Ligand binder design. Structure first.
Ligand SMILES: [Zn+2]
Ligand SMILES: [Zn+2]
Ligand SMILES: [Zn+2]
Ligand SMILES: [Zn+2]
Ligand SMILES: [Zn+2]
Ligand SMILES: [Zn+2]
Ligand SMILES: [Zn+2]
Ligand SMILES: [Zn+2]
Ligand SMILES: [Zn+2]
Ligand SMILES: [Zn+2]
Ligand SMILES: [Zn+2]
Ligand SMILES: [Zn+2]
Lengths: 53, 53, 53, 53, 53, 53, 53, 53, 53, 53, 53, 53
């Protein structure tokens, strides 16, 4: 596909995907285990920007 | 465009797009008349995954 | 790759991929277990139209 | 990236991006300063169409 | 195709595509009924810059 | 769609659809009323070279 | 490349290259020996529409 | 072009082009002198799967 | 954007923008201070071949 | 361009781009200030694997 | 991902992974068990031509 | 292909191919006869940044 999950987010380098920095959630990916790529933030920002017009 | 509606969803083969399997909604596309392609589910999943962070 | 399998066809929602509706091939995907995306139909259609040339 | 902000929306020609047609918001981009391209409306429509299934 | 018309220009929001603001051509789209996307401007700009070569 | 029908074949210039040439079949497009593009010819030559017939 | 010459024009099916139909330029191609693809036509029509001329 | 012959098949590493391993056709390429790329294999497998034959 | 400005033209090596060569105009880029890429040259040669001038 | 920098790597979330975790290079991005996307790893990996050939 | 690993290299036909040929190393793929594609060969030849070593 | 040599480097405008400016290698191209495109520069800079060397 043109845009796959891997094009939108990548495994967080801090928790290596666990979402954890024990005993707390991982601060770098705020618990998700992944961080957004520029393409993912572009798409997310766009949707949030216009979803409720 | 890079991603058109047709790249994101296709007409449901069960109801041929009607969203109906009379007398009930069509079960395969749960009433929408279309089903998601891998590219559409990837995009939808991504948005739902991060929209409320 | 530019056009991967998932860009061409998607799991049939009627048989969820088995290609079967016992005792018959699944009629929605013609026993293939997948339905074509618009890009897949476009390609199949073109090859078929010009196969003898 | 495959789809950048500029592929999804363009500066509104009426307010040149200000979101204003003084003393009121700009009517053409309904206050946002940008209007959607076909690719942006396709993506937005798709998300709104399936986000709550 | 890789770059379709809709990738290049989008219906002008001021005249909704007529190209008119009677009695004049619509000033926002220069009577064209469409405004350029960034990709359209990029292309037009390049051709114009090197047209005599 | 990256590869559309019109990117694989372009309407025949010697006819324009009727795919004919009164009273026999059109020579240029063998009656199909469309000719192949470099992309279309490329795909077809490949499939035919390997479908191993 | 994204858009190659091959993406923009095809070998004319009437003169096949020369663009000649003796003793005159090939009518179908205007002597050029090539006809436009849908991509070629889209880009050219775009430029023609806004080039100013 | 989106998909060029080069995208679909490579020079066979056993006969390097000829597809021959004297006195017989090259086993690895079936004499064709080329082996398939993952893109080639995806498209061919697609067509084979639905061509009906 | 699939095709950006910098994919159509790359800064001239003999000058670097001033598009000059004291006291006359820069030879390599004819004063435009940018030279064409294969993509840029491709597009321009096509437009010029068909704009029919 | 088809693959831009942002398609290859994204600001490291641990050092926010400085490449530093004083007094050391940031261990998460190896002092680079960026982490690779899947496309970036794929490319780096391929070049490295075949660098001596 | 536009360019995946399998688009840069395709499994060697003379071995299939072991990257060997008992008792020495595989000749065709020099022990790497994968050969280069036009895309992969293209990228590698470019990097090597400019990395200036 | 996605990225062709033509996408990565252009004919040098100082020596036009040879990369020579007698009796020395062409300064602009380092004798290579080609200069980098923005795409070439992006990919090379990427590899250089992480190759380790
Ligand atoms: Zn984390
Ligand atoms: Zn249905
Ligand atoms: Zn089925
Ligand atoms: Zn506005
Ligand atoms: Zn207007
Ligand atoms: Zn005809
Ligand atoms: Zn002709
Ligand atoms: Zn062979
Ligand atoms: Zn210059
Ligand atoms: Zn870091
Ligand atoms: Zn081998
Ligand atoms: Zn030079």
């Amino acid at each position: 596909m043109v845009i796959a999950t891997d094009d939108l987010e990548t495994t967080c380098p801090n928790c290596n995907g666990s979402g954890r920095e024990e005993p707390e959630p991982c601060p770098k990916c705020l618990g998700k285990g992944v961080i957004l790529t520029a393409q993912g933030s572009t798409l997310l920002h766009f949707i949030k920007k216009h979803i409720h017009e």
